[PDB]
Structure formats: structure tokens, C-alpha cells
Design a protein around this ligand. Sequence first.
Ligand SMILES: *[C@](O)(C(=O)NCc1ccccc1)[C@H](C[C@@H]1CCNC1=O)NC(=O)[C@H](CC1CC1)n1cccc(NC(=O)OC(C)(C)C)c1=O
Ligand SMILES: *[C@](O)(C(=O)NCc1ccccc1)[C@H](C[C@@H]1CCNC1=O)NC(=O)[C@H](CC1CC1)n1cccc(NC(=O)OC(C)(C)C)c1=O
Lengths: 303, 301
Amino acid sequence: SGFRKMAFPSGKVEGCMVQVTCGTTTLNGLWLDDVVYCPRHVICTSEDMLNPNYEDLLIRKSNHNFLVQAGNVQLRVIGHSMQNCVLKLKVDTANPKTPKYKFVRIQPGQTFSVLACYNGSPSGVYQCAMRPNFTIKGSFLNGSCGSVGFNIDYDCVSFCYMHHMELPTGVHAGTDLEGNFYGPFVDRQTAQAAGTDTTITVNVLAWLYAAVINGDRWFLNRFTTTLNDFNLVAMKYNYEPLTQDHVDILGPLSAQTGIAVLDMCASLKELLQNGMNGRTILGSALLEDEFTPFDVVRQCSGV
Amino acid sequence: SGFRKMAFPSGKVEGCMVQVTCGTTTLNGLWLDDVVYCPRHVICTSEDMLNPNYEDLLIRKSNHNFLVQAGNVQLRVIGHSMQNCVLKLKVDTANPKTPKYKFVRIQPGQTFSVLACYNGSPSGVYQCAMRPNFTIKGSFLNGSCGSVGFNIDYDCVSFCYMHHMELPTGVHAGTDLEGNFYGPFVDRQTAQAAGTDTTITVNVLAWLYAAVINGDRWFLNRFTTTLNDFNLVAMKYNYEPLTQDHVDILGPLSAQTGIAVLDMCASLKELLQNGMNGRTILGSALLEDEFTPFDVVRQCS
Ligand SMILES: *[C@](O)(C(=O)NCc1ccccc1)[C@H](C[C@@H]1CCNC1=O)NC(=O)[C@H](CC1CC1)n1cccc(NC(=O)OC(C)(C)C)c1=O
Ligand SMILES: *[C@](O)(C(=O)NCc1ccccc1)[C@H](C[C@@H]1CCNC1=O)NC(=O)[C@H](CC1CC1)n1cccc(NC(=O)OC(C)(C)C)c1=O
């Protein structure tokens, strides 16, 4: 037993990471088959960054403008195309360590693993959630751009995130691997801010179940409530609405535990008004919301 | 730029993980060159869990009794010896994915990554600290024995933990890769329990320095303290003694931020007195003790 924030093993993705240089800018790329994927802003100089014309910038560039390094080996570029905010650099050699993979786009509330990289070298791995305001709470310094987020299912890597920027409150924004942004952000130096964050209700409930499953039970009670009464207090504390689908997805654990979701809701209710005030659940003095139901089950199962 | 509990990239370890079966019992092992390393209790039943005589149990085994499998390839065992609580199987094939590696014994306070595995197949990776009472707070189910903890420095993998048991408080215990336990635990099913735990003071200070680096100063104060007055207070909240070695180690973080170690000790002292009062520090509502000074420097610069 025990309960921890856990990333997927990262080896399948470590082998796809490369370095990409265009002029003074260096950042990371993802090498799958014979294409390297990286952020389109690798083509911008500092001056261009304030108001860039990407189609114009790119037309001016040729293959020779892009230096791609895998370890010490040098990949040569035979083609270049833009898709949305991502650049696709065709290269001579297909990646021998290419895994089974697809590109997918994730919903707010869903989690995934980030492999942080610098100069094409993986530095660390951690779990994040795509927040309701479309940011992630990561850890990223200069050179991190191009790092990816992913899930693993059997042998198949599902890539969902490529890193592009930092926002004023120390939170992070990027794209799917077809170059579409998560959230209302643009790849330019301009005044941007995250919207008001909100708490992922269904994830907090899943985590209260994990607490119960692991012997922690000093928040339970005897009282059911209603979606409507609940949602009204949810609204008051900046919690997402809880839908009937949420109540369904939590079904396994209501069963496994003997505790009704709306029971759990009155527990949460009480925690919302009273405060935590330094007292703890699964080692936390705040209500955690970056574990999904599937995450809680995946980890109390052994998959 | 943010701050997260961050594991090492697990790929170098993933390619060494295998499964070891003996009778009814299956767990994980670690394949480096021509040796598979696993917990010696792979050769026990449940019958034999209370007072196993491992020397007696091993003598009665032949090589062919150990089923070792790396993915779909069955490896052939050609020899075996026991070293402390670890069993070393000699196999007829060297592991081609073997990395640069060393075996080190860590001290309490130190951190590392765990690769949780089942049936020779990795399931997740997370960071842990060796607690002062010689346990870790992990996530381990039936089948996880033989999972290992490690650090990575350049291309060199430092193996420092192999997983053996769960203890009544729901915390975990194991050995180094030479088979010696951390703590006064033993590989048998008697009643044994962890000593009372304490907070890793030097790591909490490093984390406060990390909050300052990331642009957050609300918890600082205008006071200072002697080293000795600090420890007399801290012990009252079950914090580990801070030593002169600890102070020397926080030197670099002090220089970068311009906060003297003993000034930051005064802040901590007050945070223990007051609590957070609704605020948080690097996203936490508690004082966090599983980041080391080396870890803070790694991830901030
Ligand atoms: C990215 O492009 C990257 O890693 N580039 C390579 C590189 C950059 C700097 C020096 C050497 C090499 C970064 C990743 C950033 C850096 C710090 N933390 C991160 O997550 N992305 C940007 O720098 C991004 C550029 C893309 C077009 C949108 N950018 C540009 C300008 C400003 C900001 N952020 C910002 O002003 O936020 C605050 C919080 C005010 C610092 C930005 O992210
Ligand atoms: C380890 O042997 C393992 O993973 N073995 C393979 C396996 C076991 C059971 C079923 C199928 C396959 C486990 C790891 C444990 C199990 C749950 N979480 C863990 O970290 N180690 C043991 O079961 C261990 C072996 C003994 C030291 C040599 N063991 C045996 C007996 C009792 C306990 N602990 C115990 O009593 O648990 C509490 C928490 C008190 C209920 C124990 O760890």
C-alpha cells in the first residue's frame, strides 16, 4: 500500500528526444519515424518575438538553417513544414527507437507525465494535470521548450503536450502535437495571464476515496446531500460542477468503500467551510485534485 | 519556473528489470551484466516466513529451480550465491542494455527515484527520501519486491535501494544492493515496527531557500538565532538536529539568495510557532522535507 504521485516510466520517450538549433535559439525536438516535431518559435530571434510573422519567417528559411543533434550523431533535414504552432522537420534517417505511438488531445481534469529536457537530454519526470484554465503546474527553465507530456497504455505512448511558455504566476502553457494550444494563449512575447483557476471536483473525491482505502477516515460522516445543494457550495468555493457522469466514473470506489458519492460530498462540504488549518489527509494539508479516478485505481491495482 | 517533486528518467533502469520465479513465489530482479539480483526470500513459502533458515533453503536448490524471464526471453541460471539478504543469480547471457552503474549505500535525509514494478514490468516512477527511522513512504503492492531505488549522475546509475517489505504504519523497508538492510529490520515475518519518525530539518531549510529563489518572501522575519537555540526549539516539534555539516552544505543556497543560514533558521522557527495562516509555500500547506540541497540546486539552476 501507500499512495504517491507517480509518473509513467519514461524510457520509450527518452529515446525520441533530440536537440534543435536555428541560429541563436536552442530547444528540444521529438523524433518519430523520419520527422522531428518542435515549437515553431525556434525560428524567431529576440526581435521577431514581439510581433512575429511566421509564414514570412519560414519562407525565408531553408533546410540548412536547422541543426538537429541526436546525442552526438547529427540528423540532416530534407524538408520542413508548419502545422499550427508546431514545426515538422523531415530528416534523412528514421528513428530506430521509435515506439508505438499516437497523438491525442486531452481534456481538463486529465493527467499525464512530463519529461523535462534540456539540449535534447532528459533531466526529470513528473505528473501533471491539464487544469480547468488550461495551464499546467510544472517545472521548466530556459531550454525546456519542446519537452513533451504523454500517457502509456500497454505498449502505446499517447503524446498529448509540447511545452511552449511560462505565465506570470509561475504556471505553464503549450500545445498538443498538432500545434493547437491548450487555452487562450499565443506564441508571442505579449501580455498574457492565466484565468481564475478552479478545483477539479471529481479528482478531489477520487483522492478522498484513496485516503479511505489507505486507512485515513477522519472526515467521513453519516449525511448524504444533493448534486444541487453540493454544486451550489462548489460554485461558492471555485469548484467545477459535479455532473452525473462524474458520479458514474467514481462508482467503483463508492462500492469498494461503502460510501455514497453524495455522502463524500458532505464530507468535502464540511472541509470547504471549516478549513484544513494544518490538519492532514494522505500527508497533505490541502485538498489534492491532480489524481483522476483511473489514477487512484491504476495505483491500488498494480498496472 | 515552478517546483515539483521530480524523479530521474527511468529508461536506463527499465531495461534491467526482469522477473524471478521460485515455486509459487514471483517477484522482480535486476539484471546487470551476467547477474540477476533479487531478494533472497524468493526461495521462501509462507510456511517459512517466521524463521527461515536461508542457508538451509538455498543448499537444496538447483539452478534449474529458478525461472528467470526478461520480457519473452527465458534466461538460464548457471550459478548462485547469497550475500546478506540478496540472492545473486549467474545467468548465461550478459544484459546488452546494462548501463554505467555503481552500488552506493545512502544516509537518512538523502533522496532517490523508485521504479515500481510487477512481474518484471515497470508501472511507475516517483521520488522518495530515506527517513531518519530508515523507512521510506512508498507505493508498493503485492509483487513489488525487487523494485529498486536509484539516482542518475550524467550517464552513471547509482543503485541504492531494493524493496523487501511493508511495516504496520504503511511505510516500507529494504536493503542496499549489497543486501544489508537500512534500519534494524530483518527479512522474516515477526512483529517489528519503525522507530518514531522525525522531520529532515536540513531539507526543509533547502526548500525555504527554493521558495525565496522562486520569488516568495512572506515567511522571512527580521530575527536570527544561535545554532544551539534553534535545535532546542526544533527538537520540540520532533525535528532532526541541525549540525555544522548541515550549515556548511546550505552555504551555496545562502550565497545565491543573500539569506544567512541562521537567519533562515529563525524563519523556520517562527513558521513552526505560527503555521501558514491560509498561505502556501511552493504550492504546499506543509513544511516539505523530501527535497535535498543538491535537489533544490539541480531544479532551480
Ligand atoms: C522557450 O522558448 C525555450 O525554452 N526557449 C529556448 C531558450 C530560451 C531562453 C534562453 C535560452 C534558450 C521558453 C521556456 C520558458 C523559459 C523559462 N520558463 C519557461 O517555461 N518559452 C518562452 O520563453 C516563451 C516563448 C514562446 C513564444 C511564446 N516566452 C517568451 C516571452 C515571455 C515569456 N514568459 C513570461 O514573460 O513570463 C513571465 C512569468 C513574466 C517570465 C515566455 O514564456
Ligand atoms: C514482497 O515479498 C513481494 O512483493 N512479494 C511477492 C508477492 C507477495 C505476495 C503475493 C504475491 C507476490 C512483499 C511486498 C509488500 C506486499 C504489500 N506491500 C509491500 O511492500 N513483502 C512481503 O510480503 C514481506 C516478506 C518478508 C520480509 C520477508 N512481508 C511478509 C510478511 C508480512 C509483511 N508485512 C506485513 O505484515 O504487512 C502489514 C503492513 C503489517 C499488514 C511483509 O512485508
